[PDB]
Amino acid sequence: MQIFVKGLTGKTTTLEVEPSDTIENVKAKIQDKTGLPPDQQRLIFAGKQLEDGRTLSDYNIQKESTLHIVWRLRGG
């Protein structure tokens, strides 16, 4: 069960996930494709904010679910 994430460039990035796969892991996968640090990553689905400890089955996230990558620096 893969998912498509809306990138800033508009290009979607397929990611491998599973009902068991927690968000913490997902952010980790992203940290590799985006190379961005965890403090610069944010996942939101259907306008709902995700949190660690939860799973896809909790957010009712299905396949081809459109996420949202928000890139912003917390400043110095």
Side-chain angles (χ1 to χ4, degrees):
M1 189 180 88
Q2 294 174 350
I3 50 162
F4 319 146
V5 305
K6 189 173 184 295
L8 297 163
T9 66
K11 293 175 180 167
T12 54
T13 275
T14 48
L15 271 155
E16 188 177 343
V17 305
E18 299 183 18
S20 59
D21 189 69
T22 63
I23 310 308
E24 188 175 347
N25 190 346
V26 178
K27 289 181 181 181
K29 297 197 179 74
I30 288 164
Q31 175 167 353
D32 307 319
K33 291 187 185 182
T34 50
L36 290 168
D39 55 10
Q40 284 178 49
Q41 290 170 15
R42 197 173 77 184
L43 306 180
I44 293 161
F45 181 67
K48 300 183 179 75
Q49 178 169 337
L50 312 187
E51 286 179 7
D52 176 29
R54 285 81 176 79
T55 47
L56 307 176
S57 78
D58 289 340
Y59 298 114
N60 191 353
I61 284 168
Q62 299 175 8
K63 202 177 182 181
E64 319 194 11
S65 265
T66 290
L67 292 297
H68 296 301
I69 299 164
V70 193
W71 175 48
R72 184 172 185 168
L73 312 181
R74 60 180 181 174

